Amino acid sequence: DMRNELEEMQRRADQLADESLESTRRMLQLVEESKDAGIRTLVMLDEQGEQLERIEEGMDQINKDMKEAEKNLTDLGK
């Protein structure tokens, strides 16, 4: 009558982490810095676009003025 039976106990392997808290924090800090740099680039790019738009009008005005002056001088000369 040496017929034995058993029961079982369970253990849980550690969840997936303990490497997600050293590279993670550095990743977040770098992401924040990149976000700030992107915001600054946004602002600078908008300012540059405004300045180019401003330049356009003066360019067109000088072109028109020179063309009209040349035509007038030619007309009077002949």
Partner: protein, 83 residues
């Protein structure tokens, strides 16, 4: 000069209700040192793998650090294992 090594463990036993816990707590009160660390026995076991050993080593971490810091002129640390 003699250079003998001190004792580092005591085992109290006897029938129930004879003063073991009372004697231990009174001895703890007598000594002037860091507040003695008390373990209740079944409180070390954890379901995650490897955490029981970490819990055990957390008991001796402070004593080892103090012994390293001061050397042979360090204080005495008392540990009580109930049950």
């Amino acid at each position: 000069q003699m250079g003998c090594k001190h004792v580092k463990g005591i085992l109290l036993y006897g029938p129930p209700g004879c003063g073991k816990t009372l004697l231990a707590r009174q001895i703890g009160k007598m000594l002037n040192a860091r507040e003695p660390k008390v373990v209740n026995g079944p409180e070390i076991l954890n379901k995650y793998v490897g955490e029981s050993e970490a819990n055990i080593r957390k008991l001796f971490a402070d004593a080892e650090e103090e012994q390293r810091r001061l050397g042979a002129n360090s204080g005495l640390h008392i540990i009580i294992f109930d049950e």
